[PDB]
Each structure stands twice: as structure tokens, then as C-alpha cells.
Amino acid sequence: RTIVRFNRPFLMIIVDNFTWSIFFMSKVTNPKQA
Amino acid sequence: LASANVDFAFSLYKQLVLKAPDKNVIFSPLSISTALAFLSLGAHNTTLTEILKGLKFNLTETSEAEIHQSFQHLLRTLNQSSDELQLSMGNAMFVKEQLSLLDRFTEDAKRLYGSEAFATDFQDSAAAKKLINDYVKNGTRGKITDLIKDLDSQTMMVLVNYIFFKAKFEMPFDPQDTHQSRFYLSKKKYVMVPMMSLHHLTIPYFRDEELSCTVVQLNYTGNASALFILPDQDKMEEVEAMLSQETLSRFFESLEFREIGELYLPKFSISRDYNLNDILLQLGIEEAFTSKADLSGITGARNLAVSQVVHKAVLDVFEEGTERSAATALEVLFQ
Numbered sequence: 001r002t003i004v005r006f007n008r009p010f011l012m013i014i015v016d017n018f019t020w021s022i023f024f025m026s027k028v029t030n031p032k033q034a
Numbered sequence: 035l036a037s038a039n040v041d042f043a044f045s046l047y048k049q050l051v052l053k054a055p056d057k058n059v060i061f062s063p064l065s066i067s068t069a070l071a072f073l074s075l076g077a078h079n080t081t082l083t084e085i086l087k088g089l090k091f092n093l094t095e096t097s098e099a100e101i102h103q104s105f106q107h108l109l110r111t112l113n114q115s116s117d118e119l120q121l122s123m124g125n126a127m128f129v130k131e132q133l134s135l136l137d138r139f140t141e142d143a144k145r146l147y148g149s150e151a152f153a154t155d156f157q158d159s160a161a162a163k164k165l166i167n168d169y170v171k172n173g174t175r176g177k178i179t180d181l182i183k184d185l186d187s188q189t190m191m192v193l194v195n196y197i198f199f200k201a202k203f204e205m206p207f208d209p210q211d212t213h214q215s216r217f218y219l220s221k222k223k224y225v226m227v228p229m230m231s232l233h234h235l236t237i238p239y240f241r242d243e244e245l246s247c248t249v250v251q252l253n254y255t256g257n258a259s260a261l262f263i264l265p266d267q268d269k270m271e272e273v274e275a276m277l278s279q280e281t282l283s284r285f286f287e288s289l290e291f292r293e294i295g296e297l298y299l300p301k302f303s304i305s306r307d308y309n310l311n312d313i314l315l316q317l318g319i320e321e322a323f324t325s326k327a328d329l330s331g332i333t334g335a336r337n338l339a340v341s342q343v344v345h346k347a348v349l350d351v352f353e354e355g356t357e358r359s360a361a362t363a364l365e366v367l368f369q
């Protein structure tokens with residue numbers, strides 16, 4: 001009964017599971033923002 | 035080694051946000067770290083130490099030789115293709131055709147960074163721009179095509195890194211379940227976006243009541259994974275204030291598998307491009323931009339200095355997976 005709703009600003013951090021490096025990082029404050 | 039690239043990632047992230055605190059931010063810290071480490075292969079004295087310290091390396095722990103080996107080993111694992119994941123990274127140097135480079139530098143650049151040397155007629159600025167932009171377009175498979183907008187006709191060298199990432203969701207979203215839904219820019223401002231949804235899935239999960247955020251890990255198996263951090267409404271700034279290697283560690287360590295009733299994630303595409311001069315100077319990489327620059331490991335003379343550092347990144351999130359691309363160029367003038 002747990003809901004996870006990305007309907008507000010959120011962060012993504014993309015990693016390599018072995019080297020633990022960060023390939024990419026994002027903050028999405030507005031997914032329509034051109 | 036990895037600890038350095040992460041401290042640099044968060045320092046850079048905060049500087050990026052400071053410039054425009056309500057804007058989308060997308061960037062590849064590894065692309066920027068790799069391009070600057072590549073440049074440092076040619077640096078000496080204070081120019082060199084400022085670069086490596088700015089990248090957050092401790093020179094008393096690791097030597098210059100050991101740092102470049104680390105990048106070499108990492109670069110070779112980021113060129114992979116499978117049914118789940120396409121990853122590719124490249125480095126290149128575009129060099130004024132008549133400019134004499136030291137053998138040691140071009141040997142090291144190819145062996146450690148995979149970089150070829152391309153003779154380039156920068157005086158024909160439009161042709162040089164297209165040559166570099168095509169390299170980046172080819173490396174990012176069409177996703178980044180205008181990294182270089184303006185190019186000084188007196189440019190001597192451009193160092194370039196690109197990264198391309200395409201990964202399918204382990205559990206894909208069904209497009210039939212994507213519907214327009216509110217996205218709250220703040221408590222009181224909201225737009226409608228296509229919102230993908232999944233039902234009944236088991237993913238690593240951590241609810242950080244102390245930091246007022248929920249952390250989940252999608253696509254967690256394999257070579258790469260995506261850590262999603264969802265602050266409670268109006269708590270993004272508080273979450274950003276806690277970001278660090280230590281907080282990221284505790285996030286990962288606190289994750290536990292959990293069945294999620296419903297997950298909602300927007301379908302969207304965003305891009306950003308940056309000039310990083312201001313930020314790199316703030317991070318202490320200063321001599322490389324002045325006439326005191328020492329890049330004599332490139333040519334055998336102190337006759338080069340950095341003029342511009344640009345970065346572009348593009349992010350695409352859709353039902354089947356994600357595509358991420360970024361590129362960094364370091365433009366170098368004569369002195």
C-alpha cells in the first residue's frame with residue numbers, strides 16, 4: 001500500500017554499480033520546462 | 035579514486051544550482067572530470083596541481099601516474115553493449131594542423147584516454163565547428179549536435195569528451211498506463227505532464243523521515259543503476275543541503291527491498307548547456323585560464339591556455355527506458 005509519486009521536483013543520480021562513479025546527475029524541477 | 039569523482043560531482047552540482055536555483059539541472063560529472071584530467075596530462079607546476087586538487091584528488095595519497103591509470107581503467111568499462119545497456123565514452127583532441135605536439139603527450143593521450151589527434155583548420159571557424167560537433171553527434175548518436183556554438187578563429191586546440199548511455203527499464207512502463215497528471219513546481223504552481231505508472235513492483239526503498247525524502251533504486255541489477263531521490267513537497271532545498279558522499283552512502287546502505295503499490299514517473303525530455311569558466315575558477319582551477327598557464331607538457335612550451343569550457347547534457351525518460359548523453363569541450367588559445 002506504498003505509493004511513490006514523482007509529481008514534484010526530484011533528483012536522479014546514475015551510478016556504475018561496481019566502480020561507484022556517477023555518470024550523470026539531474027534535478028527535475030519542471031519536466032515541461034523548455 | 036571513486037571518492038574523488040563523487041565529491042567533485044556534488045561540489046559542481048551545488049555550483050550549477052546556485053546559478054539558477056529553480057531550473058532543471060542535468061550534467062555528467064564524469065564527462066567533466068575526464069576532460070579536465072585529460073588536460074592535466076599536459077599540465078605542469080601550479081596549473082597541474084590546481085586542476086587535480088580542483089577535481090578533489092589528494093596528491094599525497096595518489097600520484098599523477100596513478101590518477102591517469104584510474105581514468106584509463108574506468109574508460110575501458112564504459113564502452114559496453116547488451117540487450118539491456120548501451121554505454122560509450124570517447125575522448126579526442128582537435129589540433130591546429132601545423133601545431134607541434136610532444137610525442138609523449140600524444141602517446142599518453144591515446145594510451146590513457148583513448149584520444150586520437152585530429153588536424154583541424156580553426157581559421158575556417160565554420161568547418162572546424164562542424165568537424166567537432168559531428169564527432170560529438172556521432173559519439174552521442176544524434177543526441178548532442180551543437181556542443182560548439184562559437185569558436186574563436188585563433189583556437190589552437192579543443193579537447194573533447196562525450197558519454198552516451200541508453201538503458202532499458204528492467205520492469206518497463208506500459209504506455210497504456212501513461213496519463214496526463216499534475217506536476218507541482220511548488221505547492222501552488224503546477225502543470226500537466228504525461229505521467230507513466232507501474233503497479234506492484236519490488237525495488238530497493240528507503241524512507242528518510244529525518245531528511246523528509248523517499249529514495250528508490252530503479253534498474254538496480256547489473257553494471258548500472260539509477261538512484262531516485264524524491265523530497266517531500268517544498269523540501270527539495272533541504273534535501274540538496276544534505277547531499278554529500280556521506281549522505282549518498284547512507285542512502286545506499288539504508289536501502290531495502292520493498293513492494294511498491296504504485297509508482298508514478300513523468301515521461302519527459304530536458305536539456306541544459308553551460309559555460310563552466312565561472313564555476314571552475316570558483317573551484318580553484320585558475321592558472322589554466324591566465325597567461326601564467328603551464329600546459330608545456332602538450333607542446334614543449336608554455337604557449338597554450340584555456341579559453342572556454344562548455345558542457346551540454348540531454349536526458350530522455352520514457353516507458354521502455356532512459357537515454358542520457360553529455361559532452362564537454364575545453365577550448366585552448368595560443369599565448
Ligand SMILES: COc1cccc2c1C(=O)c1c(O)c3c(c(O)c1C2=O)C[C@@](O)(C(=O)CO)C[C@@H]3O[C@H]1C[C@H](N)[C@H](O)[C@H](C)O1
Nearest residue numbers: 015016017020021040254255279282283286287288289290
Ligand atoms: C559511499 O557509498 C557510495 C557513494 C557513491 C556511490 C555509491 C555508494 C555505495 O555505497 C553504493 C553501494 O553500496 C551499492 C551500489 C552502488 O551503486 C553504490 C554507489 O553507487 C550498487 C548496489 O546497490 C547494487 O549493485 C544493487 O544490488 C550494491 C551496493 O548497495 C549496497 C547497499 C544496498 N542496500 C544493498 O545492500 C547492496 C547489496 O549493497
